[PDB]
Amino acid sequence: MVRWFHRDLSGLDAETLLKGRGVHGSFLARPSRKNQGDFSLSVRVGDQVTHIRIQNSGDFYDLYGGEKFATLTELVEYYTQQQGVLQDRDGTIIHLKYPLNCSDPTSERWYHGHMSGGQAETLLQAKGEPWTFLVRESLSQPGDFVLSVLSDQPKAGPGSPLRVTHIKVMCEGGRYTVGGLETFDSLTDLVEHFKKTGIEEASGAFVYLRQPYYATRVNAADIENRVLELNKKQESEDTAKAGFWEEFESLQKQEVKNLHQRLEGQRPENKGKNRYKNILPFDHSRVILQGRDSNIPGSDYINANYIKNQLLGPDENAKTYIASQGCLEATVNDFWQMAWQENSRVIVMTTREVEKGRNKCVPYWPEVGMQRAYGPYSVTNCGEHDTTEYKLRTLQVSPLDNGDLIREIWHYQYLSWPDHGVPSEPGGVLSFLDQINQRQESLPHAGPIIVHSSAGIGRTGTIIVIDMLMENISTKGLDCDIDIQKTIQMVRAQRSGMVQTEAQYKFIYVAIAQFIETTKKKLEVLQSQ
């Protein structure tokens, strides 16, 4: 779990690393300078960093008294799961929330970091192709690595999965070696060498490296190096336009295993309620409109889905979303019904009213000073603010029969997204989103952020994914786990075809990349107190 542990780190610079980059509950593990051979657990507590000694007797890992562990990983996971109380010298109970990662030793995609042999074995065997390789951390010997390669020999009899050989990669003296005569400056150099020559091994047998098993898990802080790698149009098969294309094709080709019920949207009574016949909400995740007759077929229908971060820890809160389509003339009143029942206080519109003389969305707000009734709800446009990229409308909605239940609704309309493709730079969207995030966070009781475009798939999907990933970095801090392909796959499970084009897919990468840089520079100005 996560790419923790550092190899050449001392307490003094471990503190500055945690205090500068990490938040509360940030932690990492490194070898102890004092008492050599043992380990240290550097944990962040508010603004102060505390260090805890870990005993390595060769048989067990403990904190000099307390339950013992086979591996250092077992010790950490234990206290992370809170299966035992962690307390430092004085007695203060310490909590292990978010780990702080070391940089990826290589920018190459075949590196998976902290992964057990069991895991490594399974997904390699799954591929099936012999001499498929993977580089990972060594869970047995903390400070080493493992080159997990799939042999051309079955592990059992015939028809059994192929055997996995684990070549231990050592980092003795800051140089990489497989225990042989030659050493390397970097893993990339080591791997590239053994691709040509092959790994011999004492017995005379051979292990070759022909095709890499790619990872998508990337350390958030080093996403810039990944975006450079994914731009490279390299492939053994030849003519595979970019590495971004392959990652996106993985998602697009996985749509065959996504046949789920969309019956309610296909009702004849709902035909005019969809902007597109082929684009419909999954029945399990569709927003269901309240206060309708039910004996009128399809009265509860709106083309919208609840979308939330399913790849997030137990009982830990985050932003929830609703991905809707741009309002049609008929659906206008239903939109507000949804907005009311879900208690949404922020709305994100990622399109213009008219694009190239073609309907993408019709307005559902009165103009400044005006007050219009939308079904059973009254809404007033209390003010408009114009920015380069976006338009902020301070809306005020309430029911008609009452009126004491007035709610402030902040409407954010992005009107700088090009007709073809994606924005030129990601800077506008980041500012746009930053303001949206601050709004929702300032409103504790606020329901899901409604995000809508035209079909509510491409532009909205892109926005949600970026925003989910941003929050993930704002909550866990940078130097954290990020898998963009998986995050998308997770939101695609809740609404069909989130993120439509490769350009949008790449936009999410470059967006977080600039976000990660502007996070580095905003800690550059603070630095020390």
The domains of the chain are located at 1-104, 105-209, 210-529
Q: Say how far apart CA 41 and CA 191 lie, in whole Å.
A: 31
Torsion angles phi and psi, residue 359, rounded to 5: -70, 115
Radius of gyration of the chain (CA): 27
Element (DSSP H or E) covering residue 472 = helix 458-476
Residue among 113, 93, 95 at smallest CA distance from 103:
113
Write down the CATH number for the domain with range 105-209: 3.30.505.10
CATH topology of domain 1-104: SHC Adaptor Protein (3.30.505)
Element (DSSP H or E) covering residue 148 = strand 145-154
SS3 481: strand
Q: Say how far apart CA 186 and CA 458 lie, in whole Å.
A: 39
SS3 130: coil
Q: Is the CA virtual torsion 144, 145, 150, 156 positive or negative? A: positive
Element (DSSP H or E) covering residue 303 = strand 301-308
Residue among 434, 397, 411, 270 at smallest CA distance from 348:
411
Identify residue 91 by its one-letter amino acid code: G
Number of H helices, E strands in the chain: 11, 20
CB-count exposure of residue 477 (10 Å: 0-12, 13-18, 19+): buried
Fold matches, 1-104 and 210-529: no
User: Distance of CA 6 to CAs 85, 109, 178, Å?
Assistant: 24, 20, 20
**Which method was used?**
X-ray
Write down the CATH number for the domain with range 210-529: 3.90.190.10
DSSP per-residue codes, 340-393: HHTT--EEEE-S-SBSSSSBS----SPPBT-EEEETTEEEEEEEEEE-SSEEEE
Residue among 252, 249, 228 at smallest CA distance from 240:
249
To one decimal, the resolution in angstroms is 3.1
Contact assessment for residue 342 and residue 407, using Cβ atoms and an 8 Å cutoff:
no
SS3 268: helix
Written as six digits, the tokens of 325 are 């389509």
Buried b (16+ CB within 10 A) or exposed e, 408-447: ebbbbbbbbbeeeebbeebebbbebbeebbebbeeeeebb
SS3 335: helix
Q: Say how far apart CA 462 and CA 469 lie, in whole Å.
A: 11
Convert 388-449 into a string of H (helix), E (strand) and C (coil).
CCEEEEEEEEEECCCCCCCEEEEEEEECCCCCCCCCCCCHHHHHHHHHHHHHHHHCCCCCCE
Pairing of strands 211-212, 132-137: parallel
